[PDB]
């Protein structure tokens, strides 16, 4: 009968946490930012269009030099583009064509990809033989890989469909730390600017904050009503934004430990597939299933623009490190670069 | 205009594009099929008669087919099922016989039929284990299905010699059960092709080929704007 008393402990703890959170809140973010000037209309238009993929595109990632990017598509290819001249630098065939993510190392020497095969593959781009080879294959997950991010040339963090996140050591190919606590498929993760913490969004309408060293979960964030498909920190690393299937985006805080603002509109009824901030964090970008990409004023929740140029759903987007451009991938097998 | 290294880079890009064209020629010439079913379906027998993913390749009349069997994931499908939005067809195998296995198969079919990303994929339906059904019924579905009593074998039914009318009535009852939700929201966007198979059957591949042929005409009739 200890189940009942543990259940009571859990519910009273939830009650006291809710009480503390409500006590810590008196004024809304919109009420404070009611006086700052708006950003006006934001009219961005296509500057480049990268063709060459055969099927839909799941993942996309910018290099640290803000010029090279890598894209993954379900046909089994992995293409590295030169965004300034629309030149294909590399074309990498994959063993399994069901790829669902890709990442590009900050140093620029490696790329990673994974998917339904439950394997994260590391590719070497600077070999003396002149081609691109597979360096390590990371096994141990029992579900599809959904995201992966590099910390340096030797460490990578992956989130899989087995409700766990893991920290790998590329040299020895072993899991050093395993993060547990989610109850649904983990769909995406984002690394902090200082690379000390990271957040993950799962299919239980909750987000968690992890510590890389001790493998411990610091805070748990709730407020969404459905699955979470995207997440990204604010530039200063004290907030993050999530996009869910309930047709809303939300901004959370790490120090006040609660919700701050909701970005929703009455005529939007499709889910969100990707989010990203601008360099100064004033603009929040989101990709939807209705083929568009809205641009939100992060401090006022007013919509500011639309990037309507795609024929199918938008599956990935990202913003360069210098903030000069934004790229969007889509299920029609085209990338567009807006500015 | 351009430097020498820029010209060489453009040449490399064009070579890569040539390779991509050579690969596209192969990619467009193959058909991808997703094999799916319940745990006790008996899909091992079907695949024998013809890690994360188990793949099988075959060709008929020098036309190549890929058949995928996703069996290395958990039991939650709403997230990884979206990858297969561009396959030509979905092969659905059910064991036509404890808990009610038929109802969960029907619910899975209903969910697949109405998904916003799978509203265009046709379904090929295989009703397996007819011998099991015959030997079981000639000796409980009326309990699992009260509306079974007031059922009449269809006029266009084609019985097989040496088969009791009880068994064929059960078979066409199950087929009509699937077809009722098949045609509830079809809209001509996609269709369902039912078939009867057994443990010993060698021509299921021919049936799959014919159904894929039919699917390929309706997309070209709609592609070239004749319908």
């Amino acid at each position, epitope marked *: 009968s200890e189940l009942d008393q543990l259940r009571q402990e859990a519910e009273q703890l939830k009650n006291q946490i809710r009480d503390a959170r409500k006590a810590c809140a008196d004024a809304t973010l919109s009420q404070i930012t009611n006086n700052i000037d708006p950003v006006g209309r934001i009219q961005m238009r296509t500057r480049r269009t990268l063709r060459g993929h055969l099927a839909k595109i799941y993942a996309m990632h910018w290099g640290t030099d803000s010029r090279l990017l890598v894209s993954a598509s379900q046909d089994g290819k992995l293409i590295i583009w030169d965004s300034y001249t629309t030149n294909k630098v590399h074309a990498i065939p994959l063993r399994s064509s069901w790829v669902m993510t890709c990442a590009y190392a900050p140093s620029g020497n490696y790329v990673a990809c994974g998917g339904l095969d439950n394997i994260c593959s590391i590719y070497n781009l600077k070999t003396r033989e002149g081609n691109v080879r597979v360096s390590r294959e990371l096994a141990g997950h029992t579900g599809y890989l959904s995201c992966c991010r590099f910390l340096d040339d030797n460490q990578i963090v992956t989130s899989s469909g087995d409700t766990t996140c893991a920290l790998w050591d590329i040299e020895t190919g072993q899991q050093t730390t395993t993060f547990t606590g989610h109850t649904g498929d983990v769909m995406s993760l984002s690394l902090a600017p200082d690379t000390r913490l990271f957040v993950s969004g799962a299919c239980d309408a909750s987000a968690k904050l992890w510590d890389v060293r001790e493998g411990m979960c610091r805070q748990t964030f709730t407020g969404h009503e*459905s699955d979470i498909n995207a997440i990204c920190f604010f530039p200063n690393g004290n907030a993050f934004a999530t996009g869910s299937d309930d047709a809303t985006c939300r901004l959370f805080d790490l120090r006040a430990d609660q919700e701050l603002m909701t970005y929703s509109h009455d005529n939007i009824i499709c889910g969100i597939t990707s989010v990203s901030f601008s360099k100064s964090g004033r603009l929040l970008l989101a990709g939807y299933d209705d083929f568009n990409c809205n641009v939100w004023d992060a401090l006022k929740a007013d919509r500011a623009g639309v990037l309507a140029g795609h024929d199918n759903r938008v599956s990935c987007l990202g913003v360069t490190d210098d903030g000069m451009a934004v790229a969007t991938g889509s299920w029609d097998s085209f990338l567009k670069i807006w500015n | 205009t351009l430097s020498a290294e820029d010209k060489a880079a453009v040449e490399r890009s064009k070579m890569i594009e040539k390779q991509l064209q050579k690969d596209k020629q192969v990619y467009r010439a193959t058909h991808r099929l997703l094999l799916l079913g319940a745990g006790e379906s008996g899909k091992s027998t079907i695949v024998k008669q013809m890690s994360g993913i188990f793949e099988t390749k075959f060709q008929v009349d020098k036309v190549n087919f890929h058949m995928f069997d996703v069996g290395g994931q958990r039991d939650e499908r709403r997230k990884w099922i979206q990858c297969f939005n561009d396959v030509t067809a979905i092969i659905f195998v059910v064991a036509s016989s404890q808990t*009610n296995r038929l109802q969960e198969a029907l*619910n899975l079919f209903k*969910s697949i039929w109405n998904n916003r990303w799978l509203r265009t994929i046709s379904v090929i339906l295989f009703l397996n284990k007819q011998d099991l059904l015959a030997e079981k019924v000639l000796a409980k579905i009326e*309990d699992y299905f009260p509306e079974f009593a007031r059922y009449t074998t269809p006029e266009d039914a084609t019985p097989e010699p040496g088969e009791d009318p009880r068994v064929t009535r059960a078979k066409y009852f199950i087929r009509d059960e699937f077809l009722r939700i098949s045609t509830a929201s079809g809209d001509g966007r996609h269709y369902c092709y039912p078939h009867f198979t057994c443990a010993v059957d060698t021509e299921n591949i021919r049936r799959v080929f014919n159904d894929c042929r039919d699917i390929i005409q309706r997309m070209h009739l709609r592609q070239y704007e004749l319908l």
Partner: nanobody
Amino acid sequence: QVQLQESGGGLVQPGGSLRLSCAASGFTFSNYKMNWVRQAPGKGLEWVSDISQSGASISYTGSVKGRFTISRDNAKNTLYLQMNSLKPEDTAVYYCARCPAPFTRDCFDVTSTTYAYRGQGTQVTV
């Protein structure tokens, strides 16, 4: 926070009647399609019934059709199940499950081993 709380149920003699209630919180009730799921001892999860956003479309599993009525009240965020003329094989634990996404007229993983958006369960014995 998606939280479903279930009430009612207990021990009833065969042939009796019962009424089940499932109070929902933390989401817009009227946008979602609600289900009922039970799990007999020594057996897996099985699906019982469902109801649309408004209440127009209603479906039932075969073994309980004609004796169970499912209804919802969008005004106060409550889901109901009127079970009458019970039978001994109806003893199980009953859950109310929400379909994963709004404005969608199908839903996948309600009868799964570890589903995030279904309640804790009430025990019914007969």
